[PDB]
User: What shape does this take?
Amino acid sequence: KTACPSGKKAREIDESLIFYKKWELEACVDAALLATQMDRVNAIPFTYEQLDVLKHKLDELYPQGYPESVIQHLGYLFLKMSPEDIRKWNVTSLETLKALLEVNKGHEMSPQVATLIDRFVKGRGQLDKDTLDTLTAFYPGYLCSLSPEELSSVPPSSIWAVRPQDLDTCDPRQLDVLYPKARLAFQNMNGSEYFVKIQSFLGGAPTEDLKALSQQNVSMDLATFMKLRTDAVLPLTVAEVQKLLGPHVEGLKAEERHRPVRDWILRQRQDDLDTLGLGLQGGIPNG
Amino acid sequence: QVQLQQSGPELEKPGASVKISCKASGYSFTGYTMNWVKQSHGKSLEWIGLITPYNGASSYNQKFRGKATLTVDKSSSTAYMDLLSLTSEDSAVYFCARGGYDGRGFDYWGSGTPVTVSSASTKGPSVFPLAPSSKSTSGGTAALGCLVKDYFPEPVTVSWNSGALTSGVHTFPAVLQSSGLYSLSSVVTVPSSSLGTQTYICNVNHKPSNTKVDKKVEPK
Amino acid sequence: DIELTQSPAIMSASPGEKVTMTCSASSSVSYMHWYQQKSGTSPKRWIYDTSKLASGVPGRFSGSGSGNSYSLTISSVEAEDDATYYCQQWSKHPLTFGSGTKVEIKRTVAAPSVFIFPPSDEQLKSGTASVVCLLNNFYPREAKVQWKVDNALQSGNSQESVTEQDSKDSTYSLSSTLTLSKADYEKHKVYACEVTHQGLSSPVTKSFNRGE
Ligand SMILES: *[C@@H]1O[C@H](CO)[C@@H](O[C@@H]2O[C@H](CO)[C@@H](O)[C@H](O)[C@H]2NC(C)=O)[C@H](O)[C@H]1NC(C)=O
Assistant: This one.
C-alpha cells in the first residue's frame, strides 16, 4: 500500500501522527519535513517502532551522515544509532555534545558515546579545557580512564580543568604523564600559588622539583607527602624533608611504617634522623 | 504474565486532587504507550491520554487537559495519573491500559480505580444477617444472605465462604439512601438439607474504612 | 473529534442466531477496534485492526468494515456472549469510543422465586429495621414489587436493585429493601411483599407477622 491514504499526508510533525501505523508513517511523512522539524520529536509520545520508521527516513535523506542540525535534536534516537553512522558525523558545538550525553546519563558509557567523543575530539584537534570539563562532568573518571599513551596527547592548557579528585583514580604512570603538563600549565606562577595548583599532581614529580620546593618554604601537607613517589623521596636529606614538611614534620612518627616514609627512614643514618627531635627510629646505625 | 496492578479506591473532597497508580509487570514498559480511560457508572468509555516512559512524553484528549497529568517512574515500572481540581463529574472508574505494538488497540487493561469526589466523610458498613426461615424455603431450596448497610464511599467487596461458595450467589448493586449512605444485599440459594451442617459465612470488605468482617448466618 | 454511533443500543438474541452490530463514524477511519465488557469488569480486547481476532476470542466472532461503517458479527450467539461491545477508532487524534451495543440473551419465560427476610435482631438493636424481599432467577427483566404493611399500600420507603444476566441461566434477580425506624417498624404487625411478573398468572404474596 505504497500510496498514502487520502487526507492523511502529513503537512507537519505534530502529535496527530502517533495514531499512524508504521506503514502510514513511512508513506505519509516526507523525510525533509522530518529533518527540518526534528526538534519536536522528543516531546511527542512516539513508540519505539514509529521512531524506528523515523530514523529509517532520516537515513534515507542523509546517506553521508547526519548534519549537526539533525544530530542536536536526535534525542532518544541517538540510541538507535550505530557507531559506523556516528563515525561519519561532524559535531562541533559543545551544546550538541551536552545534549547527546544527557540521553544516556547515569548509565555506563555506550559504544555510541565513545565514538561520539572520539569524533568530537578529532574534529576539535585536541582535548580542550571546556571539552574536558564537559566530559568529566558527565563521566567523572574520564581522565583516569585514558591510557598513559592517550593521556600524553592532552594539551597542558586543559590541565586547568583537572580538579584534585579527578586524579584520585590515576595510577603512577598516568600521574607521571600528567605532572609535566601541570608543571607547564602552572609555570609562570609565583610561590604559594604554584603549590596550591600542583599539590594534587606531585604524585608524579621527580626529586629535583621536590628539592626546589623544599628550598622555598612550602609547608607540605603530610598527607600529600604520603602520596609522593617512593623512588623520588629516597634521595632527599633530612634537612630537605624538614624544610618541605615545615611544621607538619610532627606527623612523621605517626606515619613511620608507611609507603614512602619507612623506605626513606631505612636509607638514612640515625645520627641525622635524631636531628629532628621527633624520636624517629630505623636509621643506619652509626659506625 | 502481563499485569497492570492499579491503586485502590479513592475518596477526595471537591477542589482537591488525587494521584492513582498503575504498576506494570511482565514486560519492558519503556517502549509501549500507557493510556488512561474514564468510565462513569452507567456511561461509556472516554480516553484521557497516553504517555511514553522512555522520554515521559504525553498526549492528552483536549477535554482532559488541565485535569489529568501523566507521569512515570521507570525505576518501579509505574505510571501515575494526577487528577486535579476535583469536581463531582470526576467521580468514576479510571483504567490504565497498554497500547498495542503497531497501534493494535489496548491489549492489556488494568482492573479499574474507583474515585469518588464528595464532601461526605468515609463511613464503614454494618453487616447484618438475613437468616433462613420457612418463608425463605420453597421446594427444598432456602435463601440466606447478608445486608451491608450504611457505608460510604463505594466500593464494597462481598464473598461467601472465603470464595469457595459461588453458585447461586447474587450480590445486588448498591443503592444510595436519602442519608447519603449506601446499602447493598448479598444472597445465596442453597439446599434446605444442608442448613444444619453447612456453615455459611459472608466476608465483607470496605477498604476505604479498613473494615473486614466475617459474618456467619444461622437459621432461625 | 470523530463521533462513533453504535447500533443497536440494545440487542436481544436467542442462542443460535446470527447477529450483527454496527459502528458509524462521522469521518473515514483507517482502522477500528472492538472491546467486550461484562458488568463489573475491565474491557477486554476482542477484535483489533478491523478484523483480526484477539488471543482467546471464539471463531464465531468476526469484524469488518471500512470508511464510515464498521461491523461486528456473531455467527452463532451463545449464552456466554451477553455483554456490552465498544468500538474505538484509531485514525484521528483524539481516540474516541462508541456508546456501546449491549447484548442480552433471549430465553424461555421464568417466574420468580420469592422470599422475604424480616429485620435481624442486631439491626433492631441498632435502631433501624430493614425488610428484604428477594425475587430469584426470573425472565423477562420487568417485575413489580409492592410492599404492604397491615394491608396498607406503601410508597417512598422502599428501594430496589436488579442484577445482570446470569452466565448460567440467563436469568435476572431483584431485591427490594423496605427501611423504617424501630418505632415505625414496631407500630405494625403484618409485613408483606406482593410480586407481579409475566410468569405469574396472578400476583404472588410473601408475608410475615412481626414476632411470630
Ligand atoms: C564532515 O566534513 C568532511 C570534511 O569537510 C566532509 O567531507 C568533505 O565533503 C566535501 C563536500 O561536502 C568534499 O568536497 C570533501 O572532499 C570531503 N572531505 C573529506 C575529508 O571527506 C563530510 O561530508 C562532512 N560530514 C557531514 C557533513 O556529515
Observations:
- The first helix of chain A runs from residue 22 to 28.
- Residues 21 and 74 of chain A are 21 Å apart (CA to CA).
